[PDB]
Amino acid sequence: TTESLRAATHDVLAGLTAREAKVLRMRFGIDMNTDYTLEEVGKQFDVTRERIRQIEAKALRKLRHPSRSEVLRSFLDD
């Protein structure tokens, strides 16, 4: 369940703009031993902090979007 889940997640990540996907990966510790922050996204991408919050929001629109949601919907009952 975890494996098929995670592969489906990455397959959703592939479809986005670059900064979107990479930010949303490292911001959550995905794909790494890291745990990087809004502030540190400031440090790496560019110091802008809360436009990253708005970008997170926009991506959550781009991806939640029930044409992609339904690979995730079985995991609602988790």
Binding site: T1, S4, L5, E70, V71, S74, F75, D77, D78
Partner: protein
């Protein structure tokens, strides 16, 4: 399980309870439902098999 007679049978055969085999051959069924896609994932699959 208990056994009884299959008189009609042919040599190569074994009478078999459904439910017993259903349980024994589960992940095959799951692989084949992800294949057909009726259950897109295994939570759906398990819920269907239930």
């Amino acid at each position: 399980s208990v056994i009884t007679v299959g008189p009609y049978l042919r040599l190569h055969q074994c009478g078999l309870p459904k439910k017993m085999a259903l349980e024994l051959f589960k992940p095959f069924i799951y692989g084949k439902l992800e294949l057909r896609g009726l259950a897109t994932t295994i939570k759906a699959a398990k819920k269907m098999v239930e």
